Curated annotation (Swiss-Prot), chain A:
F(1)F(0) ATP synthase produces ATP from ADP in the presence of a proton or sodium gradient. F-type ATPases consist of two structural domains, F(1) containing the extramembraneous catalytic core and F(0) containing the membrane proton channel, linked together by a central stalk and a peripheral stalk. During catalysis, ATP synthesis in the catalytic domain of F(1) is coupled via a rotary mechanism of the central stalk subunits to proton translocation. This protein is part of the stalk that links CF(0) to CF(1). It either transmits conformational changes from CF(0) to CF(1) or is implicated in proton conduction. Gene3D superfamilies: N-terminal domain of the delta subunit of the F1F0-ATP synthase. Disulfide bonds: none annotated. InterPro entries: ATP_synth_OSCP/delta_N_sf, ATPase_OSCP/d_CS, ATPase_OSCP/dsu. This is ATP synthase subunit delta. It is found in: Cell inner membrane. It is a peripheral membrane protein. Pfam families: OSCP. Its main location: membrane. Belongs to the ATPase delta chain family. SUPFAM superfamilies: N-terminal domain of the delta subunit of the F1F0-ATP synthase.
UniProtKB/Swiss-Prot annotation, chain B:
Coiled coil: none annotated. Belongs to the ATPase alpha/beta chains family. F-type ATPases have 2 components, CF(1) - the catalytic core - and CF(0) - the membrane proton channel. CF(1) has five subunits: alpha(3), beta(3), gamma(1), delta(1), epsilon(1). CF(0) has three main subunits: a(1), b(2) and c(9-12). The alpha and beta chains form an alternating ring which encloses part of the gamma chain. CF(1) is attached to CF(0) by a central stalk formed by the gamma and epsilon chains, while a peripheral stalk is formed by the delta and b chains. This is ATP synthase subunit alpha. Produces ATP from ADP in the presence of a proton gradient across the membrane. The alpha chain is a regulatory subunit. It comes from Escherichia coli O45:K1 (strain S88 / ExPEC). It is found in: Cell inner membrane.
Length: 160, 74
């Protein structure tokens, strides 16, 4: 969960992986791995194991070894490191690898969520709300917005 | 295995590739890791803390306190 060890990971992920294009390919392999630790017996059995060799062994082995050899010999790398203990850190950091690479997004304020990928501000944003259509903001629609301006307002009711 | 809970299905058949593994003992278990008679404790996980426990060859191994994973004991 340090994710910094996994930072060096996701580093080597875009790096060797995307270099191998395993950023996607071991996005697949990686996916299967988080599936492996996701196995709770494989969690229940996660660490009793002194030999990390035993771990990568029963790991690729158990799970079905969808990891690359970059991830099998890397399975020696992190498994041996035992930093393999934390799967998702560099998984969301790899999601941050390809995704950060691809980043365009949005966040709905005073609205039900948006997340419309906007490479630029207001780019897909004003295009979305303008594009609304939706325009309802349903989650945060009214009480949230009207309590936003009226939030500032009660903030004036600070005068009491 | 594949996608939902198949991930856990043939992670139980991928497990079950390996599935001989996951298990634990209470008490039973073992003294996980030790030097000089204080031990990380393996197995025996959930137990009354400080239950003097029939100890090697003899003693009632005095359960020190729950360090949840591997209890230390006297």
């Amino acid at each position: 969960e340090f994710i910094t060890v996994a930072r060096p990971y996701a580093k080597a992920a875009f790096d060797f992986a995307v270099e191998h294009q395993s950023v996607e390919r071991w996005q697949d392999m990686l996916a299967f791995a988080a599936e492996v630790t996701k196995n709770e017996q494989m969690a229940e059995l996660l660490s009793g194991a002194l030999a990390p060799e035993t771990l990568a062994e029963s790991f690729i082995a158990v799970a079905g070894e969808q990891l690359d050899e970059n991830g099998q010999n890397l399975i020696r790398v992190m498994a041996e490191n035992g930093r393999l203990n934390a799967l998702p850190d560099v998984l969301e950091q790899f999601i941050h690898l390809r995704a950060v690479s691809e980043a365009t997004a949005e966040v709905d304020v005073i609205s039900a969520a948006a997340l419309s990928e906007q490479q630029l501000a207001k780019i897909s944003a004003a295009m979305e709300k303008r594009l609304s259509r939706k325009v309802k903001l349903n989650a945060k629609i009214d009480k949230s917005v009207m309590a936003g301006v009226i939030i500032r307002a009660g903030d004036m009711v600070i005068d009491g | 295995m594949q996608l939902n809970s198949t991930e856990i299905s043939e992670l139980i058949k991928q497990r079950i590739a390996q599935f001989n593994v996951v298990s634990e003992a209470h008490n039973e278990g073992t003294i996980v890791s030790v030097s000089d008679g204080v031990i990380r404790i393996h197995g025996l996980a959930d137990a009354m803390q400080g239950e003097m426990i029939s100890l090697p060859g003899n003693r009632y191994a005095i359960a020190l306190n729950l360090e949840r994973d591997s209890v230390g004991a006297v």
